[PDB]
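INPUT
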Amino acid sequence: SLTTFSKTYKPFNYPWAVDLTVKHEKAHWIEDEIDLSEDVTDWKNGKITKVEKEYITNILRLFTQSDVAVGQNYYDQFIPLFKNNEVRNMLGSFAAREGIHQRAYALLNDTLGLPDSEYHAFLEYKAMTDKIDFMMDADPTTRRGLGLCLAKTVFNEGVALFASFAMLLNFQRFGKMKGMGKVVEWSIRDESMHVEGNAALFRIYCQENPYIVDNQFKKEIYLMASKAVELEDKFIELAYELGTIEGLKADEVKQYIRHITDRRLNQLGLKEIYNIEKNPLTWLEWILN
Amino acid sequence: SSLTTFSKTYKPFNYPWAVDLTVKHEKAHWIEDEIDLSEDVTDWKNGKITKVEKEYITNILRLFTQSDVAVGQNYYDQFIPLFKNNEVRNMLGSFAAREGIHQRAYALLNDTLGLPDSEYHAFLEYKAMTDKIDFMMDADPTTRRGLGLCLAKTVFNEGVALFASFAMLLNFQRFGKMKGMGKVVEWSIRDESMHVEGNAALFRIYCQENPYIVDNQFKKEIYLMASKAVELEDKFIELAYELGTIEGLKADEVKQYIRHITDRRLNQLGLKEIYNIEKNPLTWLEWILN
Ligand SMILES: [Cl-]
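OUTPUT
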């Protein structure tokens, strides 16, 4: 099973986990390899407006002040229980990659000379995130609760902060802040693989423990998806209080968040609940693949 | 606050050396698919590798693939659950992920050389002695004292254990043979050297933060770990040289090399040397490890 130490390296019980780990290691990147020189001149020489600067400043402050505990759910919920070698090394590889993201955002903060502060426009989004997480009452000690923890991680990595990612990518859409866009783009490429792995693990985990997939179990996951959309909606509401974004309207970001939330439910093996046919931000589709 | 408490903010760092070492460790990232093994295949088929040299490599690789099947076990089950400090945890998690690349690299060597699987190899007594010692060791990370000893033990596992087989595998590229395999071993040791540096630094910091665990009996248990590590490599060397001789490599200098780096690891843990081998006996191996 997923929860037992491997007897030998081969044959693989979960070959897809090896293949995805190999693909994830090939996408390895480090924060120091990204050219930020043009972002600095973009920032100093008035190419970034005063309102665009507050958006970037407040989003990066939200990034550096949230999810400070890198890989917490990998190290404390999934890795202790999934002892199978190929699955454990997948999860360990995902968790290590999250550390690169945290260093990348810290290097963006410092390269742009952003001042330290505890306050930003999105404190209500962070507090709403912590409240939602407290009410989920994530219990990995039961087979049923571990399944729900896996589904929750798919929304954390595949929906949470994606509204902020679209806003940061709005700059590289027009040739501005391209180094920051590369950080976000490669972060999204990582999270897409993490979502793919955690969702596949979720589907396999439900087959191996079929008595956890009850009528309320599925309903609780649909609630998770709708709570993630409600959370991203709150981010969008707070973000547009700062001013407008060139070529990007609040209503279409909310539709894009609903579109990718339906993708995550499909990846978990559940049905769509918003039925947004096309992603309204087609300039992003290359980065979302 | 301490090594065992979650960080409140990312910066300032409580343990900046751990971030710096993680950054340096991630810059050394490599994947098994990037090493060229084509010339190792021709070396193997076209008689450049003698019958005795094939038995050395075949048996060592079988020992590698059949042991440490659970990658990062001590990281994931002993240290990461307890070291909650962000920068230290991400360091250990980064080390643990890198061990998965080593396992895939050695499996790729096996498959590229078309080596047959069987369960028997020449070092079964060495592996059994290793597993017996660890099983009758009581690795106990749940106590303040035992966690320090767990850290010292990992430093000998990663910095001493199997280094005799590493010298034998690296002896081939010295003569222009099995160079792709040589890269695998060399890049694996470059990783392990960083893991040893981090785990040893963590051990020293952990002893400062829990100073009352450092008694006479505590150090004696660590010095025994060192002497048992040398005894294990000694059994490996005795078993390996029963297969024949190695061109340019004598058993006694391999035994001196193991005693030399065992003293290096004790110094890295902050303890005193017990073998006093002044110079590295294998100057060609220190050079390729830079
Ligand atoms: Cl249960």
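end of record. Chain A touches chain B through 37 residues (CB under 8 Å).
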